[PDB]
């Protein structure tokens, strides 16, 4: 390093979080006016697939970092009349612009601003986790701060979005939902009054941005609430056993720490209710709640479907003794939780809906919060062939794109070959008439031995047959986090 002097950018680390087809940095802001398509893209698909990826503008100041900490890079694939175009742009966060001003990374440990350079922006957010259309803009979200608005067509950054000053929490979820009956934005905040606070808030916003209802209450301790579930009548907050200690953070340590002897906790509250209506339920220890597939309620009972994993998958938030289990050890599958508000019992056990591990679930947007029978999922089957030119098996490697029928319990999956894996899918209805889950499943396919990327389109009526269309991208797309479909 010394012979590089002080005027070069420092090298990226040679760690797994910066290596291979999935995690090597890209940093490409791009416009591709027309994409090559193999196969036949249905001409009736009309709208934009937005996705956000962490994609660090600079090598991290500390010489190491986690995937979840990268500057948000939003892609929009716009589908019209059989043609697809791509725009990819950074969210111009205060954090990004400060780093660009200095020409280097100014930010330290994930969600620990005490370890930043004093020239870092005050707002620590990277707006890197999800995207959703709301009130005429695209919101780029990350759960440590308010979201950042972008122009739906150009992906120009509009600024921090405060919802016309109505949202008074310190943070806003990256897992809001759109209510399919009203178009309301259903959202929440944890650590809602600052670092380490136990405050939780539910928010409900009209499609035109008006705050319709809020419910402030407190958890028994500060914990990660990554995703949530909203039904017709209830909201459920899953508190993952990852706890916050501000003193540990002042000393340079991680924002969260896994607690292996702390029950999974759920707060269940009426959607139009108040703090005093909150009820708490407890699940097993040493397990953690994945992303919500869907949820609904009927009579006394709230049902929530999600992956549940039997131990700490977050190696960067280790328990106090430093131990982290080998990810391969951990039992995971899709589960249904049932919260019976009329029962005597606080204690819940999740019931399996699959016998295989999976993540990145997607239901039909039109059935969010309602009784439903279908989900799309990514899964990893370790017995499928794996081309050794892929390199070592990366974090968030999923070699199957799956349609699960909840009525029969059967799965219909596409395997893309031994050099392929997937990013989070979206579902596009075949028409506004179409029955539940009848349409197209669209996802990025990473061809990791070639370091190439395609956006694939499958027909939900026959997933095993593979793509009806493969949209070739002329550069490698880094692994992403969440995306959404915005219908024209
Ligand atoms: Fe998420």
Residue numbers in the entry: -6 to 481
Copy text from the publication:
Lignostilbene-α,β-dioxygenases (LSDs), also known as stilbene cleaving oxygenases (SCOs), catalyze the cleavage of the double bonds of intermediate stilbenes (e.g. resveratrol), yielding small modified benzaldehydes. SCO enzymes are one branch of a much larger family that also includes carotenoid cleavage oxygenases or dioxygenases (CCOs or CCDs) as well as 9-cis-epoxycarotenoid dioxygenases (NCEDs). Despite varied amino acid sequences, the enzymes share a common seven-bladed β-propeller fold that orients the four fully conserved, Fe-coordinating His residues in the catalytic center, adjacent to which a hydrophobic substrate-binding site is formed by a helix-loop-containing domain.
